Amino acid sequence: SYNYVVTAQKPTAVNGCVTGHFTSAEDLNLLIAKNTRLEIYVVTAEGLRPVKEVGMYGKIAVMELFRPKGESKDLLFILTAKYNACILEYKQSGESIDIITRAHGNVQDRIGRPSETGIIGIIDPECRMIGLRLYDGLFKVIPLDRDNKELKAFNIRLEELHVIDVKFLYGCQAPTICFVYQDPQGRHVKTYEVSLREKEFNKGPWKQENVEAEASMVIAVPEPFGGAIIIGQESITYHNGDKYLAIAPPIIKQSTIVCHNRVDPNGSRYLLGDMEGRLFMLLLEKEEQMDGTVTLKDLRVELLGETSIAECLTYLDNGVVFVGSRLGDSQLVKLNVDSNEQGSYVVAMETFTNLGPIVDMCVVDLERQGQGQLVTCSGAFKEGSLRIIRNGIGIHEHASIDLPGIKGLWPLRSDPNRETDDTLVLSFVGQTRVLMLNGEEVEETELMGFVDDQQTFFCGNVAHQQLIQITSASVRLVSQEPKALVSEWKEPQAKNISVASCNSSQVVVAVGRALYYLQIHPQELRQISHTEMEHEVACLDITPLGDSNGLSPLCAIGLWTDISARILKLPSFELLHKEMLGGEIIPRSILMTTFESSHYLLCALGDGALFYFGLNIETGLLSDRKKVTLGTQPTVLRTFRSLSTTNVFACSDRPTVIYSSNHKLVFSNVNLKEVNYMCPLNSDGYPDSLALANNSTLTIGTIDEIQKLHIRTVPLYESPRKICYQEVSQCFGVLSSRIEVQDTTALRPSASTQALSSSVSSETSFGEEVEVHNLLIIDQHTFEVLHAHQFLQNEYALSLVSCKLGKDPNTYFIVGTAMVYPEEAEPKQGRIVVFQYSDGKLQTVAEKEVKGAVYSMVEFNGKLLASINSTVRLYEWTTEKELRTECNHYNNIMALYLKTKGDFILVGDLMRSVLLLAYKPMEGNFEEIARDFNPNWMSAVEILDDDNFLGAENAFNLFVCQKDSAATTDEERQHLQEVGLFHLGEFVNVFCHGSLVMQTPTQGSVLFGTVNGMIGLVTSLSESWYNLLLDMQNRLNKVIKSVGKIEHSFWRSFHTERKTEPATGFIDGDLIESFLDISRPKMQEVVANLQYDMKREATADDLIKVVEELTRIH
Amino acid sequence: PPVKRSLVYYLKNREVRLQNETSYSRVLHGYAAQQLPSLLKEREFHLGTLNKVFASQWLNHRQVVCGTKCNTLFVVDVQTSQITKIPILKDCGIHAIELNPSRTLLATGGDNPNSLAIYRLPTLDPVCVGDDGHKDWIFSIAWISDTMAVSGSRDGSMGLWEVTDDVLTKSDARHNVSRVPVYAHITHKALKDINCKVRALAFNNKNKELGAVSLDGYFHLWKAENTLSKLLSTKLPYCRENVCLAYGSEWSVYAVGSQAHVSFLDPRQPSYNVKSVCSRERGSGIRSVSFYEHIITVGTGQGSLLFYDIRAQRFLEENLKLTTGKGWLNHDETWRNYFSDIFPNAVYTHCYDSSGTKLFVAGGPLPSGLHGNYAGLWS
Amino acid sequence: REGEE
């Protein structure tokens, strides 16, 4: 098998940020590390001007800043999670910016083992040496120097195995180190002093104390005080050898401080802040003495306020505090000197979106347009939300009117003092309507100067402080004041007009076959030029482009009998080019538009086929002919201004925006059910917006960003686990849990209590914390909790399915639950419950009392496949509407996952790899076809096709194992081989069959959602493609560079604690795509001497157009 | 508070990364350990005509080394079914194989069943000769530190030997100045003497003791903090055929075998807390024993592995019991004389995996006059 | 018969 993996959306969660003068000597920088992703911001008086972002070949694990002596700006130390120490700097020459590496080198000890509180990385304050605690029992040390290019370490055998935290004390002659460790006697603190010449730990300044039981997180106060602050759970302590101060605030005993930051550069004030989002402030009371000694007086803490569940704080200046979160969003709150509401010196200022952890996901198509939106679960504990991701272009619904049967929509400005909109003009067959816009408000009316009994074809604001509108029998040019018909032109032949348009000084109408051009003069229309066209005209466009003040002499048309488009030059209407589109149905709309100063024309037919051409207005000539198909009904190609960019819309039954991306025109099916006509809008409440007349209504809204994905946070205020879907009921089932403190009473108004309707299904010491579970039927239009159901007490719920069973025509919801207790290793109880949601009120059908913990369900061809603890089971849905057991299957340590495809089943196990089954229908029992004999710890399975299988191991790796049909005996036809090994980098939670793009090298699409909020896509390939792309790969890894000089093949290699071998049969979509965004002279090195097809050697532009076909997949 | 103990908390926290931590690394295994016994399946290996497998030790996830009665030393791959034969070291074949705690040296017998040998893992190059400290056999080779080893013997000598830093250096230098095997002798830093034969050993790794066993039925504990210093002795509970003994590094009990019993011994505690679980498989003799988290794997002569639970005091599951295959046999003259009227391959050795999933059994036939290999990998 | 040490 030959696969392909690429990421749809880069990580979002934040696991470490730092700050300081990286980019220059005075520019206070902020630096955030997402997962393998580093981001450098400048800090300004109002925001965070982003400066750079780079990608590491490794999961950042430790990031620090330090300024050595003799260096103006700072240096940055980075340690990946495969032990790649590197030391970075920051160059800058005009716009040429890059991140040089001054030192690099792996520091993994040949044979050790990992640590029980992860890596730790610290630096002395005098910039002499880095200290790392990778493995237990030892303490690796990298002496800073100039002659240490290769980071060259050396261990020091600590006699303490279970270290818990460590820091480099302040104000000390030779490097000292203070740390807290555990021991059979408790938890202690101790200081050693490293000797960089004898390479050993001399006894250090003060003594081993005896510290609170569950301490952690020591701090190193700066110069004027010195010493250390230890923050346990129920107390805070100051140690300096002689002195000792202990304060036990009553508040902080509620949750556990996990981060901190030094606000003042001399230790006065400290930021803290615990699990559940809160934020404190730690104060150091100075008691300076007579002889000059500055000492301490006392310690006190006070609660600032609330914010997201924070994971790495930061203080910049002026009261601006960066909060960085991993279980939710990351704010930018600001600090006040005085409380307002109930006491809060913190009020938000901004927010950055964060998808992780993606605990589930389910791809659906809500309009049956077959495009793809991607509802997911996210966050935790007070930040659990549902996101709704979707490719395309955004159209919010800020308002809507009941206006069906619409034929035309435009903007108009009734006040000649308003450069913004206050008029939305409507057409209907045989009449014309107007819409007064007061701010965000829209109200039906008639704008005098406009006909009430004849149909109109265009209107706009033009030169000479007036508007225009072309009617069925006339051109009505109307001054903006007092909005009365000031000029009117007519057709000589007294024929009813059918199609028309106008601009600042020019008008073009088409009646019958004759095309008339009309001149705009002060409240006057003058007849100059007009021609007689061979065939009937459908479309006519004089939209001026770019930077001109409403003048363009080109007119594009399309024909009714000779199906094609044409271009013309005003005033003479002289035919400049005739371009045959094709298709089956007549063209209806044509449009010209600016695109990065490039003129682009698009002519659409009635069958949904649109032909788009580059324009030369100097020659009116058409070029770069290409085609697209969108739908089946007529289309409307209208220009828009928004996001400082002007582009085209094709209004169809699957409407789309045609906009630009890197000088290449990208299409996107826009978030609209079905639209008939459009009017872009610039009201004082609708800046750069649009009103969209559909089959029944006119939806007024404003665009999202035209960028590719668009999230939609639906807060829930508890933690969601599972999601499902039921199209015959037009809803979603979701499972959720909220952490209701036992005494039991909850803590927030949550979406499971704020329920429209509700129901409840039918060791006890206080101060505990139990979790309570609910089934919420989220709606699907207004995403509101139509119902919530409560399970028994203690009863977790692990599994959900919505499915049709057996000989019954009803779809149901089915759950699998487990009576979890706190002192039991294996759940010896469980249930599987099937209920249905009718008449808006959800009711219980039946239940089945299992004897295990149902970690999975699927619907196996009208039957129920239920994975209970260690045994798969298969169930049949009988006619008395009960479940009756059909066939068991033992032989599993812990069955945890399930898939099916036809008559095959792919179990995945806690600690052994995947296991194939099959259902022999002749006798009705399970035949274990094969299995895999490596001990992998699984997280997610998938049936890539009928033979390959795909799995994800919790050491962050991907593997593809296939049924070796090339076997002979019945011993090697019971092993699964291993064709694919990859080091992903992330801990996948869920696979799903789908794709977020409008419907071939690739022959599939699976999506997977990680814990760092990534979204990635895996698709098979063909052996010729694979062997081309892999050679291209190994050629890429010779010209491209790496931040930190890490080696691609080193990173991707299947890595675990025991084995380690290169990657087999995958392709790095990211690297391949980054082939594009480089310089052509460096694209000349890679291309030479390839295996293009037959065997031959392609060229640069071939490799260009051979991977664009790989972006259209994601 | 009560212990946060349930697999579901680990399962659901793992999904968020929030506190999936290593306070669970001991329940996952306490669970897998009682799960495996019920779902193992043989997979025979074809050695050929070698005599009987006596020693076996895992080297990797895939290569396990075995030593036979014909003093062969061979590495078998468990994937490709590939036997590779290696040299032997000069100065009733191999009887015990061990790896230093750092998995860098390998301390087994040599061409002389009374001398020793030292190979440098993971490349197997020969390093030392066997020393003279034993004129009788070597029946056990325990490792006490990264460079000190203690060797039992069939005479009674308990000679501490120790690979020196100097031979380490001129061994990482002797394979550079040459590529032909070059050896180097060592002197037994001690030769402490003691039905007076040092058959089987153990090693506690905190008190740094070496509670051995002597087939007459006498436990002999000799602490080795850095050098040997005999501590105590005791007549063991059962007398006949005490040939196997191991120590559960986290239960403070020695499991020692006998003719038809298995005894749990606390050394610093007297002889009134001695529990001898009966195997009832009368006629085999417990030829091996080993500790998984709380589960004792007993490997007997009639060809069957048995499982006991130190915590629930009873056997797993009618008690679950595997059974070794047929393997191979020789039809020599003594096969005709006294052993033709009838083999239950006796498991002399068995070892789990670093990943704790795949077990490896080996052995041969129980009557001493016979000649036949067997080795099988049970996952 | 036996005698396997």
PDB file of N, CA and C in Angstrom, chain B residues 26 206 247-252 292-294:
ATOM      1  N   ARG B  26       1.118   0.876  36.813  1.00  0.00           N
ATOM      2  CA  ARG B  26       1.143  -0.340  37.599  1.00  0.00           C
ATOM      3  C   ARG B  26      -0.207  -1.021  37.684  1.00  0.00           C
ATOM      4  N   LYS B 206      18.080  -3.681  46.153  1.00  0.00           N
ATOM      5  CA  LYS B 206      18.134  -2.576  47.099  1.00  0.00           C
ATOM      6  C   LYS B 206      19.002  -2.920  48.300  1.00  0.00           C
ATOM      7  N   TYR B 247      13.292 -13.878  42.660  1.00  0.00           N
ATOM      8  CA  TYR B 247      12.879 -12.880  43.636  1.00  0.00           C
ATOM      9  C   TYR B 247      11.971 -11.847  42.994  1.00  0.00           C
ATOM     10  N   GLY B 248      10.793 -11.654  43.582  1.00  0.00           N
ATOM     11  CA  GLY B 248       9.873 -10.651  43.097  1.00  0.00           C
ATOM     12  C   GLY B 248      10.230  -9.274  43.608  1.00  0.00           C
ATOM     13  N   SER B 249      10.832  -8.471  42.733  1.00  0.00           N
ATOM     14  CA  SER B 249      11.495  -7.220  43.088  1.00  0.00           C
ATOM     15  C   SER B 249      10.598  -6.223  43.810  1.00  0.00           C
ATOM     16  N   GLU B 250       9.299  -6.502  43.890  1.00  0.00           N
ATOM     17  CA  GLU B 250       8.370  -5.584  44.533  1.00  0.00           C
ATOM     18  C   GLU B 250       7.387  -6.312  45.437  1.00  0.00           C
ATOM     19  N   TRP B 251       7.721  -7.520  45.875  1.00  0.00           N
ATOM     20  CA  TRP B 251       6.880  -8.230  46.822  1.00  0.00           C
ATOM     21  C   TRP B 251       7.633  -8.734  48.040  1.00  0.00           C
ATOM     22  N   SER B 252       8.957  -8.598  48.069  1.00  0.00           N
ATOM     23  CA  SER B 252       9.768  -8.979  49.222  1.00  0.00           C
ATOM     24  C   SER B 252       9.557 -10.445  49.590  1.00  0.00           C
ATOM     25  N   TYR B 292       5.831 -12.179  37.073  1.00  0.00           N
ATOM     26  CA  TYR B 292       5.176 -11.049  36.451  1.00  0.00           C
ATOM     27  C   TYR B 292       4.381 -10.367  37.554  1.00  0.00           C
ATOM     28  N   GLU B 293       3.841  -9.184  37.277  1.00  0.00           N
ATOM     29  CA  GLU B 293       3.489  -8.221  38.320  1.00  0.00           C
ATOM     30  C   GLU B 293       3.022  -8.849  39.622  1.00  0.00           C
ATOM     31  N   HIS B 294       2.066  -9.757  39.553  1.00  0.00           N
ATOM     32  CA  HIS B 294       1.617 -10.458  40.748  1.00  0.00           C
ATOM     33  C   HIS B 294       1.324 -11.918  40.444  1.00  0.00           C
TER      34      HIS B 294
END
